[PDB]
Short mmCIF file of C-alpha atoms and ligand atoms in Angstrom, two decimals:
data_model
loop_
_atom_site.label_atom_id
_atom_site.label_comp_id
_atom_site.label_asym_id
_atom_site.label_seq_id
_atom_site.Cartn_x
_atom_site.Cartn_y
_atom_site.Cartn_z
CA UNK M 1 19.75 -6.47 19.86
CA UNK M 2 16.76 -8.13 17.91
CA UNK M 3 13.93 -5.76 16.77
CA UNK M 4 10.04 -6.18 18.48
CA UNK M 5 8.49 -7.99 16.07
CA UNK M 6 5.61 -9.31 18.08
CA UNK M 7 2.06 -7.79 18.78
CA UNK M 8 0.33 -8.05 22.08
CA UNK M 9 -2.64 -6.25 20.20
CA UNK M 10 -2.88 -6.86 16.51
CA UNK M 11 -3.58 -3.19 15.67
CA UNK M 12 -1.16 -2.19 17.82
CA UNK M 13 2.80 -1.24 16.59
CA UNK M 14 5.28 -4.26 18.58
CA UNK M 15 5.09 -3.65 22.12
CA UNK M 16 9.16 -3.08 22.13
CA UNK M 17 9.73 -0.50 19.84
CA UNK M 18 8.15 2.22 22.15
CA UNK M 19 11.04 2.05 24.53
CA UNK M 20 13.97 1.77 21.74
CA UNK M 21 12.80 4.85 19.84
CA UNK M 22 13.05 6.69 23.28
CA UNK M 23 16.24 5.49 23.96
CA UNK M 24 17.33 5.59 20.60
CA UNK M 25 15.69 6.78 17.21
CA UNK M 26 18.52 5.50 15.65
CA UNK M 27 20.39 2.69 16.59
CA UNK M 28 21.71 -0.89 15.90
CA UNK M 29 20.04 -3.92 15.80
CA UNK M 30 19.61 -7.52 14.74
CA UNK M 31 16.79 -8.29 12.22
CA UNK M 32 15.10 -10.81 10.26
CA UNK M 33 17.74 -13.32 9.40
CA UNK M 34 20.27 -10.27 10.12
CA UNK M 35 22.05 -9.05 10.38
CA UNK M 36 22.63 -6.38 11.61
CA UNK M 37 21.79 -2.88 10.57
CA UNK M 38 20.74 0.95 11.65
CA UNK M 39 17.15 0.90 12.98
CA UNK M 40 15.53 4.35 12.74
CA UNK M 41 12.03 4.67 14.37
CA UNK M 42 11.64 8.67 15.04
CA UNK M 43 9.48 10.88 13.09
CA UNK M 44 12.36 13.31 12.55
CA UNK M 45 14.78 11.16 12.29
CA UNK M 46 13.07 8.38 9.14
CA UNK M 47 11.88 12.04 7.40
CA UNK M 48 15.91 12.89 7.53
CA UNK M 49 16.86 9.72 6.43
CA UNK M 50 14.09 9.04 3.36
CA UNK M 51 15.01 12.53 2.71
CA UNK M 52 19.17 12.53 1.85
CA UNK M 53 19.94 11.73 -1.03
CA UNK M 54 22.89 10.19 0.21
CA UNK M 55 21.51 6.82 0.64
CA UNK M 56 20.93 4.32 -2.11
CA UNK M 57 17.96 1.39 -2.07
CA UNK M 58 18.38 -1.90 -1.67
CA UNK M 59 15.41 -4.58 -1.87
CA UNK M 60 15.18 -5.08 1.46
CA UNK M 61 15.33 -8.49 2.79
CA UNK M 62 16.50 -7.28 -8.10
CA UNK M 63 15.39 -4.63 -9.98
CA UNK M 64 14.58 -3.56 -13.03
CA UNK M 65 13.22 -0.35 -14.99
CA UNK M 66 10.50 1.24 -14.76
CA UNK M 67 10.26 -0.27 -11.55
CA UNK M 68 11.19 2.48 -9.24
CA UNK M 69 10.81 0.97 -5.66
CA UNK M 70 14.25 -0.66 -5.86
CA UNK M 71 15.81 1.61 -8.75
CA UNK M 72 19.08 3.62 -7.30
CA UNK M 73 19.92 7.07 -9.76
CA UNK M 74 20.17 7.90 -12.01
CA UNK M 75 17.96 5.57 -13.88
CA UNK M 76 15.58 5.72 -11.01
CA UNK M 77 14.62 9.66 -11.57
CA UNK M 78 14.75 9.17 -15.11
CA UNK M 79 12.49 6.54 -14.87
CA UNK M 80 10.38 7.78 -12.63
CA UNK M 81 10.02 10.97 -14.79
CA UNK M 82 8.97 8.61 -17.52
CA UNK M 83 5.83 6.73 -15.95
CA UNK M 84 5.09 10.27 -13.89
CA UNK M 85 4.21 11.60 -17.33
CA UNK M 86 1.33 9.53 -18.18
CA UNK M 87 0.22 7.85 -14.77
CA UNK M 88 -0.54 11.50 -13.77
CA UNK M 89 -2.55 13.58 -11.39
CA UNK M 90 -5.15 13.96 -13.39
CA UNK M 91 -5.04 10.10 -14.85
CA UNK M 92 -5.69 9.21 -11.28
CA UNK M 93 -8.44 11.65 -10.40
CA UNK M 94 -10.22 10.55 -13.90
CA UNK M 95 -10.62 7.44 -12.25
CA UNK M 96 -13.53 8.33 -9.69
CA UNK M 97 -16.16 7.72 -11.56
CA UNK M 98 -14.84 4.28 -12.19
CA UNK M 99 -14.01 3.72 -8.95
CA UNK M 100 -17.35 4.42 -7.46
CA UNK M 101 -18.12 1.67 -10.36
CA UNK M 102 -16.34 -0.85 -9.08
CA UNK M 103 -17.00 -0.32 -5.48
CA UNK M 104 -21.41 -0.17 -6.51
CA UNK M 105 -20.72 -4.02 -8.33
CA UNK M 106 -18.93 -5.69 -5.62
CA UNK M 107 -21.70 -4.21 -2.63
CA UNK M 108 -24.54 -5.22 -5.07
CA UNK M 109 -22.84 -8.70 -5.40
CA UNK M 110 -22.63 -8.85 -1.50
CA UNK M 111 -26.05 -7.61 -1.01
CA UNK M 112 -27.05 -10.69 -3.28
CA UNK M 113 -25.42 -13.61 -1.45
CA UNK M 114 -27.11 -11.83 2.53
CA UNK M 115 -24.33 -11.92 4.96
CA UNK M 116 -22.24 -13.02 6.71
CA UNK M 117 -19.58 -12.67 4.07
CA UNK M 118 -15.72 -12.50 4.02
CA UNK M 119 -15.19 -8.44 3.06
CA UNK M 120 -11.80 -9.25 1.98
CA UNK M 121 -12.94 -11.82 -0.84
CA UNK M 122 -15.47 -10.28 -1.50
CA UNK M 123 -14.49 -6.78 -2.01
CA UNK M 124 -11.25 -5.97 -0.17
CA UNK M 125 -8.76 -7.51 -2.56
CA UNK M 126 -11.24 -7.31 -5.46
CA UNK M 127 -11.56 -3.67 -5.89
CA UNK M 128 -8.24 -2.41 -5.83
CA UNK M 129 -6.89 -4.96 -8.62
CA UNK M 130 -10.34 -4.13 -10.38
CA UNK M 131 -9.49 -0.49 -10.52
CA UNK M 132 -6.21 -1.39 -12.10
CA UNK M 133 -7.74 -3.62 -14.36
CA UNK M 134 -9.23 -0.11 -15.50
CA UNK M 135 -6.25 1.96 -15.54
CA UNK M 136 -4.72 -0.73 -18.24
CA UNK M 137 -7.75 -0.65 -20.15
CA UNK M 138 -8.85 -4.12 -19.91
CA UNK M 139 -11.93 -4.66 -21.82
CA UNK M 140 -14.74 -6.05 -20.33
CA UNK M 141 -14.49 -9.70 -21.64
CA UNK M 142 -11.33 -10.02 -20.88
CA UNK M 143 -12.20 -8.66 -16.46
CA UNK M 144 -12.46 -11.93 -15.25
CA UNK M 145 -9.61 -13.74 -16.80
CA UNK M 146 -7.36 -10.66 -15.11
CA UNK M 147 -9.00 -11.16 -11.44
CA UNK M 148 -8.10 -14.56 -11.49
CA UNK M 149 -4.50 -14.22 -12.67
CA UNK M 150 -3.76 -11.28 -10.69
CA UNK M 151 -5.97 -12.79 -7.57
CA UNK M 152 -3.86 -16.15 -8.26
CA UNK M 153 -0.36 -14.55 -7.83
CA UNK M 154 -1.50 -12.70 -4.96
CA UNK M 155 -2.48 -15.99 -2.93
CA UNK M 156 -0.07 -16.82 -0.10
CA UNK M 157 -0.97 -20.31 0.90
CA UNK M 158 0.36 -22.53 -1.56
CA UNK M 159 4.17 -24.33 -2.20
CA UNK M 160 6.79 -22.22 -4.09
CA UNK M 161 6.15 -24.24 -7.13
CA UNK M 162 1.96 -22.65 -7.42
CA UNK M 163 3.31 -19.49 -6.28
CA UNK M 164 5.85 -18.96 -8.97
CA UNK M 165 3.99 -20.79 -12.03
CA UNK M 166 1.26 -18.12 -10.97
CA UNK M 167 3.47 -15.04 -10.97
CA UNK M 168 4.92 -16.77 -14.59
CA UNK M 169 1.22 -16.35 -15.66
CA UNK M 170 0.96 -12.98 -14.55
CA UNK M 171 4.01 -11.87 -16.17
CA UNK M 172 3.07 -13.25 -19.23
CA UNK M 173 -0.62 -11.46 -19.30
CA UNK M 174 1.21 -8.93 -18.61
CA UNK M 175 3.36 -8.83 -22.02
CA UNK M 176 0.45 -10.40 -23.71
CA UNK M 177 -1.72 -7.17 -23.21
CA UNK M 178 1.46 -4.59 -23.84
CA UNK M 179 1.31 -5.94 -27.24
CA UNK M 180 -2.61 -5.93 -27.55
CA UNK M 181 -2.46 -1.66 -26.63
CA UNK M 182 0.49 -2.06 -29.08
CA UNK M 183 -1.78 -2.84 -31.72
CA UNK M 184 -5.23 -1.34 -30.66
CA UNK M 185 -4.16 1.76 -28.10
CA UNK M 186 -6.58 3.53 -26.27
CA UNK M 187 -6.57 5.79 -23.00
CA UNK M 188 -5.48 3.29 -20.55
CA UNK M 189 -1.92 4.35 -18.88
CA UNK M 190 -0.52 1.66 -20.95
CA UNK M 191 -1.54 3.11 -24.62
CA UNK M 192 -0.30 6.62 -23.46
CA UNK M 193 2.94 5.00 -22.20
CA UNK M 194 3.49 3.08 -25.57
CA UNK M 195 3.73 7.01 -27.21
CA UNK M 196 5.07 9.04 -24.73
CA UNK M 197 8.44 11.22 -25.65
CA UNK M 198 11.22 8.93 -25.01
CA UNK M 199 14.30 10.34 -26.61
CA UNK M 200 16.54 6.87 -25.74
CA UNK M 201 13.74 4.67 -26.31
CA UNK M 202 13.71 3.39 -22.65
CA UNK M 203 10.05 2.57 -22.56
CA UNK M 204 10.42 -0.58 -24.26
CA UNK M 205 8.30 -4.01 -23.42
CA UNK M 206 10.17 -4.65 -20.06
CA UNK M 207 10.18 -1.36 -19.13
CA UNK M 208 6.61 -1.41 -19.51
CA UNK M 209 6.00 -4.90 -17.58
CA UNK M 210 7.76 -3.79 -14.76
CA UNK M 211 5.79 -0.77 -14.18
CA UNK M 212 2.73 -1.91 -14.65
CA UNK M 213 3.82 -4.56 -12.25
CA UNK M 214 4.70 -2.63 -9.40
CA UNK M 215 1.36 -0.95 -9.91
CA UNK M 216 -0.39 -3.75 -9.67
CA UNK M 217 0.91 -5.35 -6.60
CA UNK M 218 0.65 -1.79 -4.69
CA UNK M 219 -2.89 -1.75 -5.69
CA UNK M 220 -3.36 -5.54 -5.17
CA UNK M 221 -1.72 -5.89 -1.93
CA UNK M 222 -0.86 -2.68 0.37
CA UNK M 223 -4.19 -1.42 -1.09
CA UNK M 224 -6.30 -4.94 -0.26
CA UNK M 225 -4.52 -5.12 3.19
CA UNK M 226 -5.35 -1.42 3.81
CA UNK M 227 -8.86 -1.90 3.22
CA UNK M 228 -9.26 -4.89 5.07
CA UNK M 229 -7.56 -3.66 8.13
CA UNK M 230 -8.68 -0.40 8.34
CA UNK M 231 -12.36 -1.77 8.17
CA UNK M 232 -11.60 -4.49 10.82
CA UNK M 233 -10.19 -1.64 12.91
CA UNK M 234 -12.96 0.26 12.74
CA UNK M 235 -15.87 -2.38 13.09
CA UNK M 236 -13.61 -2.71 16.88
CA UNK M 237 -13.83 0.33 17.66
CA UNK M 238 -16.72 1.89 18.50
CA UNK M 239 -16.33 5.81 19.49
CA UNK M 240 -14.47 5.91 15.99
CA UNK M 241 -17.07 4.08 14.27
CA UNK M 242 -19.82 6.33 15.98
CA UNK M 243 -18.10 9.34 14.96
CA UNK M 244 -17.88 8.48 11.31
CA UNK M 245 -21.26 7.04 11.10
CA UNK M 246 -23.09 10.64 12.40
CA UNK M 247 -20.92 12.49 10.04
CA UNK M 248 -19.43 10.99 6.83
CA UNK M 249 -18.36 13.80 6.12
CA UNK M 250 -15.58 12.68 8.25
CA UNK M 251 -14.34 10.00 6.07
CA UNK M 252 -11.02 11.80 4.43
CA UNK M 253 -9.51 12.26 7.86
CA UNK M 254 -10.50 8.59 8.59
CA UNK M 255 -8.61 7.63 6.03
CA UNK M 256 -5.48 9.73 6.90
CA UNK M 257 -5.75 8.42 10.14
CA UNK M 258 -5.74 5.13 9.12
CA UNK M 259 -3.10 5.49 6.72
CA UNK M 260 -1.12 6.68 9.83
CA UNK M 261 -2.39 3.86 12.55
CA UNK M 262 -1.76 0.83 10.09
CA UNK M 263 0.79 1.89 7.45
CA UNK M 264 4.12 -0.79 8.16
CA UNK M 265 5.80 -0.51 4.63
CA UNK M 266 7.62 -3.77 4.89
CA UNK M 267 8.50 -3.30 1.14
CA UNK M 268 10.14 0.09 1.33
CA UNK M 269 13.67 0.01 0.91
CA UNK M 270 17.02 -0.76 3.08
CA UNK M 271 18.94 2.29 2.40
CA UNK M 272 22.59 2.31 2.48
CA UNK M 273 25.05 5.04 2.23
CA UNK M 274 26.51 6.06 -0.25
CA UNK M 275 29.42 7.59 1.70
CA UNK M 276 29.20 8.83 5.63
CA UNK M 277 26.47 10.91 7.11
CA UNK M 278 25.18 11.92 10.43
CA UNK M 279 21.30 11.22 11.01
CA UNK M 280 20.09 12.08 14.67
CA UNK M 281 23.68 13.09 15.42
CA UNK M 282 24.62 9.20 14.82
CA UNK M 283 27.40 8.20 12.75
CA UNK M 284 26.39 6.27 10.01
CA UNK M 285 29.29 4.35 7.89
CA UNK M 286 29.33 4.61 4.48
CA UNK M 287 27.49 1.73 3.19
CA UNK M 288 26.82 0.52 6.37
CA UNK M 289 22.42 -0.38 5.82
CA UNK M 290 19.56 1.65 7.96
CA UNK M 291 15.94 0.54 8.24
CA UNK M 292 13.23 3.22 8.29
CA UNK M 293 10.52 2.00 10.38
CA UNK M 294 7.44 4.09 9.57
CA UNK M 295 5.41 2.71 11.57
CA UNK M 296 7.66 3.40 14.14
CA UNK M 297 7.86 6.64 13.29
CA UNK M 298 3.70 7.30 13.04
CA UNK M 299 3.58 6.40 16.50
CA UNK M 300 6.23 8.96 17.40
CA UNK M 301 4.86 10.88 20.72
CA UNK M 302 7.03 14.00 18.94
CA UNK M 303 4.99 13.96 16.27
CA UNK M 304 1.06 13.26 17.41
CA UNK M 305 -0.04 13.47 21.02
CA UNK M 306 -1.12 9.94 22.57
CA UNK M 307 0.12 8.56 19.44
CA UNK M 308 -1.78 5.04 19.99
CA UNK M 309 -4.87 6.48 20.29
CA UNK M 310 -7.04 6.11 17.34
CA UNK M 311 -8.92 9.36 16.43
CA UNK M 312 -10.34 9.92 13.12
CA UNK M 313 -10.61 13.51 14.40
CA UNK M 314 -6.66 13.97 14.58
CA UNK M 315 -6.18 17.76 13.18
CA UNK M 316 -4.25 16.82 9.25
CA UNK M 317 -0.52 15.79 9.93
CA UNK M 318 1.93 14.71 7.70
CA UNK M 319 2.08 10.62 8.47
CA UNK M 320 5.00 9.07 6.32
CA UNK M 321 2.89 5.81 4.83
CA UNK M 322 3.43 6.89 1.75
CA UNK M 323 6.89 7.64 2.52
CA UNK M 324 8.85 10.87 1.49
CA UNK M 325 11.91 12.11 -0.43
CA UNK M 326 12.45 10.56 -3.70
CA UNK M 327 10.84 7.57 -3.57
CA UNK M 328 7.43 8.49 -1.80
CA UNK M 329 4.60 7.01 -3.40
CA UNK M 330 3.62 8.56 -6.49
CA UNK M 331 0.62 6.13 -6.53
CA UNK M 332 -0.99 7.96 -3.02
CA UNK M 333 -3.27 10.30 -4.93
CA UNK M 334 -5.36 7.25 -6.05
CA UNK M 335 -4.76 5.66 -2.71
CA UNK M 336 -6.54 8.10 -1.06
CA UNK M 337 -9.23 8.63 -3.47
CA UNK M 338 -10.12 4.55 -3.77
CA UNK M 339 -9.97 4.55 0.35
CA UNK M 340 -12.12 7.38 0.74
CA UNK M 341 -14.97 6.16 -1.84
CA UNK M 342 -14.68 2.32 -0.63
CA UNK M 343 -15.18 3.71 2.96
CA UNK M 344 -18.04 6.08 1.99
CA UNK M 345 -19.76 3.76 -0.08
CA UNK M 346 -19.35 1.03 2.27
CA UNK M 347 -20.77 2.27 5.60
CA UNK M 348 -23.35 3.91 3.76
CA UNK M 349 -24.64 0.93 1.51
CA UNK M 350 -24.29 -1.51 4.47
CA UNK M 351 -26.24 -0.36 8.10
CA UNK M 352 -25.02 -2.17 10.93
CA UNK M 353 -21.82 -3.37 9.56
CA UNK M 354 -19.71 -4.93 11.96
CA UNK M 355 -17.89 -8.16 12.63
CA UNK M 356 -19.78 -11.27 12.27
CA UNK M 357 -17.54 -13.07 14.50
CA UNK M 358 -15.59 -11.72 17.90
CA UNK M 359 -12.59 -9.59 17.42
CA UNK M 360 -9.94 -12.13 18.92
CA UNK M 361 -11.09 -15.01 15.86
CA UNK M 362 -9.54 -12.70 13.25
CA UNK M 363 -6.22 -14.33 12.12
CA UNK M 364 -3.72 -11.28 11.14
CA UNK M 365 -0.20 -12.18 9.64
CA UNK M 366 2.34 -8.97 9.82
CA UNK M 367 5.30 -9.22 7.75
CA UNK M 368 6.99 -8.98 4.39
CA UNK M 369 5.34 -11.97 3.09
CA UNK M 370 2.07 -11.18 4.15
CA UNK M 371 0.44 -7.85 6.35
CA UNK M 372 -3.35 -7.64 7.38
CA UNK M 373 -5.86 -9.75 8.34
CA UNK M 374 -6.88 -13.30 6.10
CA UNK M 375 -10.39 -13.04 6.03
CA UNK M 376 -12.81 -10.33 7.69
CA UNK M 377 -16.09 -11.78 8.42
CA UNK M 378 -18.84 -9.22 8.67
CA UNK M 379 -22.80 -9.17 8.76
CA UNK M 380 -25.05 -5.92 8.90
CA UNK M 381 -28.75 -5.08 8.74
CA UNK M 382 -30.92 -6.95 5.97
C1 LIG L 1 -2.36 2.10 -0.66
C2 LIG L 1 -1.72 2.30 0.46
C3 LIG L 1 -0.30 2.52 -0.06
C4 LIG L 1 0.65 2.75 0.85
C5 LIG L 1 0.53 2.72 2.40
C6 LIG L 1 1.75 3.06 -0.02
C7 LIG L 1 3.01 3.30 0.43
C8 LIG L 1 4.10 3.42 -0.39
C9 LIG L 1 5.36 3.67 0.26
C10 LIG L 1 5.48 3.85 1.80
C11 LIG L 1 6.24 3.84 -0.73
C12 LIG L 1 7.74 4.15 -0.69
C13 LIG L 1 8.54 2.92 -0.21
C14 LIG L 1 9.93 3.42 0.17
O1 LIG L 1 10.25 4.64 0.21
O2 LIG L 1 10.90 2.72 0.54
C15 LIG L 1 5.48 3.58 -1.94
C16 LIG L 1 6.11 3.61 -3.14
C17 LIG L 1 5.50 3.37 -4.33
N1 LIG L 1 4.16 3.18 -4.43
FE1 LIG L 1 2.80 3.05 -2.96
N2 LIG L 1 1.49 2.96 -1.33
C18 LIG L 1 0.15 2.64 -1.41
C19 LIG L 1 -0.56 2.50 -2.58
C20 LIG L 1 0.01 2.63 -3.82
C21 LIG L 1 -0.74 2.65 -5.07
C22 LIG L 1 -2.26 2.56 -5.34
C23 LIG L 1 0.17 2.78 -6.04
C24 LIG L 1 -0.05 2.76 -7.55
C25 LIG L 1 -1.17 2.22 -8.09
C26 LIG L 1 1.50 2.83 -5.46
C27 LIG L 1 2.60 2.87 -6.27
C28 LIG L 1 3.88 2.97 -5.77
C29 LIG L 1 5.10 2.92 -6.56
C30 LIG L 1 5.20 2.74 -8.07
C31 LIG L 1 6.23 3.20 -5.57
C32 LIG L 1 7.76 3.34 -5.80
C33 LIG L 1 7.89 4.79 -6.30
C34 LIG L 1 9.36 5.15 -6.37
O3 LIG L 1 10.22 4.34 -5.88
O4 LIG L 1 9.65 6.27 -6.89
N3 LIG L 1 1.38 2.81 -4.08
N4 LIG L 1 4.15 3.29 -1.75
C1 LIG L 2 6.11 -4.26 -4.35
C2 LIG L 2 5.80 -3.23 -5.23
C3 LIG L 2 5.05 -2.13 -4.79
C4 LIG L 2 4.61 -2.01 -3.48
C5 LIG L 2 3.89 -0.89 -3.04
C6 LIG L 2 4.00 0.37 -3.49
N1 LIG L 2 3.17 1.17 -2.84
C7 LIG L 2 2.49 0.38 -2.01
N2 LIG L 2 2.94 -0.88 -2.11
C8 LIG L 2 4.90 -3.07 -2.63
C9 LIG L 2 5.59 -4.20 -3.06
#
C-alpha cells in the first residue's frame, strides 16, 4: 500500500497520510522504489521508535566517521562524543554576533539592487553556508571562493556528471583547508578539532572531512530550505504574519512553529532492528526496516490540537524536526538561533515584505533530492 506522497497544498503534509496514521501509526507500506517497509506516522509512536536503541541506521533510500547521520554504534557514540566536544553549546551560541553579521550584509546587498528579488539567492541559501564558512574559520579572501564551491554542489539542475565534479571540488576544499588549520590553527571548530583529546587518534583527515561535511550540507540545505519556506509560508499567511509583525517579540515561537509545520527529514535514517521489538503494540521483525515520518508525526491530532493550523502562538511543544534519541540533531542549537535572527532581522529591515508574485507561481519540489521552494520572489516598501 504506496505512501501519500502528493500535496494538494504545498505547505500542507500529503493529503493521505491523515487517514493511515488513524488507522494505523504503524503499519506496512510500499515506498519510493520499495519496497516495502514499517511506516510510523504517530507522535508517540516515531518518539518510541527514534528512541530504542534497538534499531540500527541505514542511509535511507555509505558512511563514514565522523559522520554521524548514518553511523550505527559503537563508532557512532564515540564519534559523536568526539565532534560534541568542540562543536559545543557554547561554540554555537559564540556565533550570534556573527550571525547577525552575515544576515546585516546580505539585507544591505538586497536593499542595493531595490526589489523584486529572489530571497532564496539572495539570502536564503547564502546565509546559512556563510555562517559555516565562519565556524571553519575561513578568512575573508578566501569567502567567495567557498560560496561558490559550496553553492555549486548544492545546485540541483544539472547532469550527474556537473553534479559530481562539483561535490569532487567540494571535497577537495574541504581537505585543502584541514591542512591550512593544520598549519595555521585558530578558533574555528576545525583548529580545536585538529587538538582535541583523542586517545586512538580517530580524528584524522577523513574523519575531519566528513564532519565538516555533514555540517555543511545541514546548514546549506535543511537550513536554506527552512528559511525559504518558512518565509514563503508566512508572506501567505496573513493572521500569522500580522501577529508577528505587532510583536516580534514573537519570533522564537515562530520559529518552533515552523520547525514543526515544515520539518519532513527526508534524510533521517531507515532504522532496522536489530532483533524483535514491539512499537505501538506491532510486531516488528528483526531487521525487518521502519520509516519515521516526522512530519507525520508533527501533524499528530494526539499531540497539538487542529494540528494543520498554523499558529505562531502554539503554547512550546516538543515537535520532533530535529529528531530525538541518539541521533537528534546536535546542530539545533544554532538552528534555532540563525532562524530566529534571519527572521528578526528580516521583517524588521524589510516593511511590507511579501510575495512579489501570487502564491500558486511558486514552484516547490518535496523530496530527498530536493525539499522547499526554487526561488521566492518578494518585493516590500522602498
Ligand atoms: C535547520 C533545520 C534542521 C533540521 C530541521 C534538522 C534536523 C535534523 C534531524 C531531524 C536530524 C536527525 C535525523 C535522524 O534521526 O534520522 C538531524 C541530525 C543531524 N543534524 Fe540537523 N537539522 C537542522 C539543522 C542542522 C544544523 C545547522 C546542523 C549543524 C550545523 C545539523 C547537524 C546535524 C548532524 C551532524 C546530524 C546527525 C547527528 C547524529 O546522527 O548524531 N542540523 N538534523
Ligand atoms: C545530509 C547530512 C546532514 C543533513 C542534515 C542534518 N541536519 C539537518 N540536515 C542532511 C543531509
Amino acid at each position: 500500500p504506496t505512501v501519500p506522497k502528493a500535496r494538494s497544498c504545498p505547505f500542507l503534509p500529503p493529503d493521505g497520510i491523515a487517514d493511515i496514521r488513524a488507522a494505523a501509526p504503524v503499519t506496512r507500506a510500499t515506498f519510493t522504489s520499495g519496497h516495502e517497509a514499517w511506516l510510523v506516522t504517530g507522535y508517540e509512536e516515531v518518539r518510541a521508535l527514534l528512541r530504542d536503541s534497538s534499531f540500527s541506521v541505514q542511509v535511507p533510500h555509505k558512511p563514514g566517521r565522523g559522520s554521524l547521520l548514518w553511523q550505527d554504534e559503537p563508532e557512532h557514540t564515540s564519534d559523536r562524543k568526539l565532534l560534541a566536544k568542540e562543536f559545543t553549546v557554547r561554540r554555537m551560541q559564540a556565533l550570534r554576533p556573527n550571525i547577525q553579521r552575515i544576515v546585516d550584509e546580505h539585507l544591505d546587498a538586497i536593499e542595493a539592487r531595490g526589489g523584486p528579488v529572489d530571497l532564496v539567492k539572495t539570502f536564503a541559501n547564502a546565509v546559512p553556508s556563510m555562517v559555516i564558512s565562519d565556524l571553519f574559520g575561513v578568512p575573508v579572501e578566501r569567502r567567495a571562493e567557498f560560496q561558490d564551491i559550496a553553492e555549486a554542489m548544492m545546485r540541483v539542475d544539472q547532469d550527474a556528471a556537473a553534479t559530481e565534479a562539483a561535490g569532487m571540488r567540494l571535497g577537495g576544499l574541504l581537505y585543502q583547508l584541514v591542512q591550512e588549520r593544520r598549519a595555521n590553527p585558530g578558533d574555528d571548530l576545525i583548529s580545536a578539532l585538529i587538538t582535541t583529546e583523542d586517545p586512538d587518534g580517530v580524528v584524522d583527515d577523513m574523519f575531519l572531512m566528513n564532519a565538516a561535511g555533514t555540517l555543511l550540507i545541514a546548514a546549506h540545505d535543511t537550513t536554506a530550505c527552512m528559511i525559504g519556506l518558512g518565509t514563503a509560508l508566512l508572506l501567505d499567511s496573513p493572521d500569522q504574519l500580522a501577529l508577528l509583525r505587532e510583536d516580534p517579540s514573537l519570533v522564537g515561537n515562530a520559529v518552533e512553529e515552523l520547525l514543526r509545520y515544515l520539518t519532513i527529514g527526508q534524510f533521517g535514517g531507515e532504522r532496522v532492528a536489530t532483533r524483535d521489538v514491539e512499537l505501538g503494540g506491532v510486531r516488528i521483525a528483526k531487521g525487518e526496516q521502519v520509516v519515521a515520518h516526522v512530519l507525520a508525526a508533527d501533524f499528530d491530532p494526539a499531540f497539538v490540537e487542529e494540528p494543520e493550523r498554523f499558529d505562531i502562538t502554539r503554547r512550546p511543544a516538543p515537535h520532533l524536526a530535529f529528531g530525538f534519541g541518539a541521533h537528534q540533531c546536535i546542530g539545533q542549537q544554532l538552528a534555532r538561533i540563525e532562524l530566529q535572527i534571519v527572521f528578526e532581522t528580516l521583517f524588521r529591515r524589510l516593511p511590507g515584505l511579501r510575495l512579489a508574485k501570487p502564491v500558486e507561481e511558486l514552484r516547490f519540489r518535496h523530496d530527498i533530492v530536493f525539499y522547499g521552494v526554487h526561488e521566492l520572489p518578494v518585493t516590500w516598501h522602498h
